[PDB]
């Protein structure tokens, strides 16, 4: 039940402003130090800022000085990263973390991260198309089926199957950027050749940046 939860991340235009929130529970931020760390897509970790909420002491990485401000509200148990004058190079997943106990220099608990995408391109939700199984398409002893989640922006999308009931044998591929400047991915699942045309398979797609949710039934074509 120690937990940190980041919010506030998303698509913003270059030069724009965004405020990230890091909501703590199970401990008081007043008792410790809160940090932000970011990670550009496919890159390594980069430390961004830290604060000691009790006295307001802050430090910053040179890459964000004068543009970003770290702050905190102990009454809300929440820390903030106000990001102004945003640039493409600020595109990353932003993680908040803490130190615990009096154990300095060890980030023991982290949030799940929030993606910040800095781009002039606009949000767009996906179209979802079936990758249909067939009894005539068996390999390695099973059938396969899936959903093609096409033409969205920005990242990310999530895909579940049968509302979370179906997890075994699922692969949701990393998105690829098309020449159109839109993302696309497929999520697939292997299943028994016996299950086809009798078991229901539904992919549940959520693209939060566009408030787009789709449940697509995927079945053998007739």
């Amino acid at each position: 039940e120690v937990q940190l939860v980041e919010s506030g991340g998303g698509l913003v235009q270059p030069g724009g402003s965004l405020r990230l929130s890091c909501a703590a529970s199970g401990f008081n931020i007043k008792d410790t130090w809160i940090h932000w760390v970011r990670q550009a897509p496919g890159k390594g970790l980069e430390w961004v800022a830290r604060i000691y909420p009790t006295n307001g002491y802050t430090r910053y990485a040179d890459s964000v000085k004068g543009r970003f401000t770290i702050s905190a509200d102990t009454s809300k148990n929440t820390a903030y990263l106000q990001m102004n004058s945003l640039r493409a190079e600020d595109t990353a997943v932003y993680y908040c973390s803490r130190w615990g106990g009096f154990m300095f220099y060890a980030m023991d608990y982290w949030g799940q991260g929030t993606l910040v995408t800095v781009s002039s391109a606009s949000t767009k939700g996906p179209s979802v198309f079936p990758l249909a199984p067939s009894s005539k398409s068996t390999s390695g002893g099973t059938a396969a089926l899936g959903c093609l989640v096409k033409d969205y922006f920005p990242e990310p999308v999530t895909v579940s199957w049968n509302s979370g009931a179906l997890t075994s044998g699922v692969h949701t591929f990393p998105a690829v950027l098309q020449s159109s400047g839109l993302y696309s991915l497929s999520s697939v699942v292997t299943v028994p050749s016996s299950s086809l045309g009798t078991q229901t398979y539904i992919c549940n797609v959520n693209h939060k940046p566009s408030n787009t949710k789709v449940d697509k039934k995927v079945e053998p074509k007739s």
């Binding site: 980030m107 079936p130 990758l131 990393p174 690829v176 292997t190």
Partner: protein
């Protein structure tokens, strides 16, 4: 300024092997200044997890197979008995400086026995074709090693430049990969041709495997 140099930048090793990763300060540091080096593990889609702090202390709940050590300006993370779940990128971090800095990372891949892909081809949906575009998908499932080659043909015409590939991260249980290859065509081009084929070459396959469909058949 002061940086950590991590090596190797990547490695593959078998289950049960001993792996050592190194982190080296970029310069000389005055004696008695502590760096309080920490090691983190990061799996796909997840936040980093703390493994080791203050050079050699095992963080609570971390398996005993991980240990850290340090001497002078050189720190090591050691995994004594590599498990399939240890696929990850490992990072050191130094606190000589404020701000502290991270090593550039070490990608650890699990080596396992050769496994050939299962291969599936999917035609475009009638729903998509309405839009003007057809996507044809070829799936290679649960294979090892990661290297594989996919070739597309449309009525025996080799397609070059109109496909994209995606590869899954290594599976944390079975150490395999899967891969998709997506061919994009206009509706009008799709409807002009019959035979759609994906041919897969991979080390676990004695000869290439071809999956195909004929448009308008079932």
């Amino acid at each position: 300024d002061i940086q950590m140099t991590q090596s190797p930048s990547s490695l593959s090793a078998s289950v049960g092997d001993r792996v050592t990763i190194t982190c080296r300060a970029s310069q000389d540091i005055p004696r008695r200044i502590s760096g309080y080096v920490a090691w983190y593990q990061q799996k796909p889609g997840k936040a980093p997890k703390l493994l080791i702090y203050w050079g050699s202390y095992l963080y609570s709940g971390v398996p005993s197979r991980f240990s850290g050590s340090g001497s002078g300006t050189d720190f090591t993370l050691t995994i004594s008995s590599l498990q399939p779940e240890d696929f990850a990128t490992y990072y050191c971090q130094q606190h000589y400086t404020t701000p502290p800095t991270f090593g550039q990372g070490t990608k650890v891949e699990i080596k396992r026995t050769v496994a050939a892909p299962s291969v599936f081809i999917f035609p475009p949906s009638d729903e998509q074709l309405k839009s003007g575009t057809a996507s044809v998908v070829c799936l290679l499932n649960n294979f090892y090693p990661r290297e594989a080659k996919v070739q597309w043909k449309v009525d025996n015409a080799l397609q070059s430049g109109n496909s994209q590939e995606s590869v899954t991260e290594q599976d944390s249980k079975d150490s395999t990969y899967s891969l998709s290859s997506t061919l994009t065509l206009s509706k009008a081009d799709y409807e002009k041709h019959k035979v759609y084929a994906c041919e897969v070459t991979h080390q676990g396959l004695s000869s290439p495997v071809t999956k195909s469909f004929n448009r308008g058949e079932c």
